Symmetry: D2
Subunit: 199 residues, 4 copies
């Protein structure tokens, strides 16, 4: 078992004009590719350190493991959260949960937007599921810190607000990017992730 770069499930230009082909190609073929390759490198070092009982060396590898590991986890989810067939609103039980937990779909969108706009530096906004409480929850994460690994929330929808996710097209104006991304959210996927949490 090595970790592998998943293929993007649509063409690089499939999200235009919301997210351009240049961004999608760099983001997938350069950024994600680097995280998974560097993850495998870090994991092999960690296995060596673990088998030798070298605790210092394990601890020294944690930043790279969290960063590259998180990068792989986060982007793998992100690509499935987007789709040319996306946008609009979810339906069914997910929609019911959104209304119940956030008041309305628009109030939810404002809350996830606010979380995403509010990241200072690099990071992600998330809609997650709190297994303990049995309800939806919004959280922000710095850098590539992954949601489940660092908070326990099960990821449903992630919004990447690293500058590489938007800068070529939207420059400094992160809010223009967050307005555009709502048009390509794959609610079919977010719904599947939500229904997998409930039983």
């Amino acid at each position: 078992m090595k970790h592998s770069l998943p293929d993007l499930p649509y063409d690089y230009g499939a999200l235009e004009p919301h997210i351009n082909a240049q961004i999608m190609q760099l983001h997938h073929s350069k950024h994600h590719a680097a995280y998974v390759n560097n993850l495998n490198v870090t994991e092999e070092k960690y296995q060596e350190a673990l088998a030798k009982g070298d605790v210092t060396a394990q601890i020294a590898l944690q930043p790279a493991l969290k960063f590259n590991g998180g990068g792989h986890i986060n982007h793998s989810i992100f690509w499935t959260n987007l789709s040319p067939n996306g946008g609009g609103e979810p339906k069914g039980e997910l929609l019911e949960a959104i209304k119940r937990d956030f008041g309305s779909f628009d109030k939810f969108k404002e809350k996830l937007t606010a979380a995403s706009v509010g990241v200072q530096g690099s990071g992600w906004g998330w809609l997650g599921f709190n297994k303990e409480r049995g309800h939806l929850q919004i959280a922000a994460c710095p850098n590539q810190d992954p949601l489940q690994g660092t908070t326990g929330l099960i990821p449903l929808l992630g919004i990447d607000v690293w500058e590489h996710a938007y800068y070529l097209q939207y420059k400094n104006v992160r809010p223009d990017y967050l307005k555009a991304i709502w048009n390509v959210i794959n609610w079919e996927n977010v719904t599947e992730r939500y229904m997998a949490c409930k039983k």
Copy 2:
């Protein structure tokens, strides 16, 4: 006393082909402008909270104050650290200190490059002066955390490795950007900052 956006001391295209005019214009007129304006906003809120003794409100403002305050501090130094008249090596006492503390100028460049390349997410690489020890020191800082405010080191040379500093021109390849930036380092300015530390 309000904080103010300092004018850039050369034309937006003065650093071409090392850093392009589009980057310089966005970086100064959008990014820095936002930090100083948001700094002034945060500072006024903080003065209000301070005068009321509202400790909760002071603490809630710290992230914005450090981020925008640091953004203003960092970029103000950064613009003076670059120049169309830059590149090459420093001379005099700065050069002597570099050789003494790092072995050689090239060994120093490798160490500051390594610090800058090593930032995971957004941040800065710094050459600083340790007043206590009386010598040079390299450090990295996350996001806009400023060097003197968070470590006590006096900043001499800063390298911005936020994606907005390089992405339009160099895309994901941060090492191409760090190779290019050596050509525009204003050693006259770094020398002035160094001599101001010594007495």
Copy 3:
């Protein structure tokens, strides 16, 4: 304003046998007193730095302001959260909220105990109110980071798990302290704080 050490609402021995008199006296008269005194020193330094527009100094003072400010906020709440007349369960709307959000009072105790036991190093366990979601929420905070200032949750009940809160009596056995403190929870105060969050 010039912050002051609040009077303890009861005798130093009033929470025996659950928290001994030596601990209460130290905790109030030395620890909380130090936070107040250092908060006042830091706030005066911040006033000087604001007047000069010294952003570096403002940032350098943040750790002392969060630590000592947070220490004052947290302990001022903590004293009111305990009582010689405390223990048992709350009643009315707070108990209804606890049952709705955590399943039962005993499951709530389990979760707040677990958050408090889980703190690695110094910190606090909290029951808070989430104003946006209109429900209760458990969180943990490191060091003296205060709940409202760092998370937006309104504090209802805090459990101090700094070693100074229990060590003289319980030594390393934090879970024994956690079991004992349920006997002195002032549910009247927690109820007042909860009702204040609602209109």
Copy 4:
């Protein structure tokens, strides 16, 4: 490997009056023992997660691995840094290094004391060796974050300023503990660690 609690190099009462026997016994047999036991549990969980390629689980275990792993690393060094035959000043090349890098032995003590007193919450003060710069360096570390694993500096002398290291004897008065511990520093061990850093 299966990590083990090392035997203490002396009797629990051998550092009296400076660190009392009750503290040493607790510190070794309960605190350090817990770090070892929890390190072993966490390392077995990491082995399971590596075998499955569960990156989320790997990341979720990082806090426990750094905390307990760091706790084992730090305390294993600390015991060897103290001795009933300790105190006074080092000699030879280590004393020459201390004088060169800090001005004098008394100025070195001032600086390491100040780093150790300055820790807000739980942590450690360290004298370390910087291999790249070929000189001594003082640093502070939060919680159980280990020196080498988090900074690259090689540990020479550690001062534990967790409340459990002093509280039963010194209560809140950390500076008194800091003054007393100079009487039991095992400069032979610190010297061995220093000579090992050089060729």
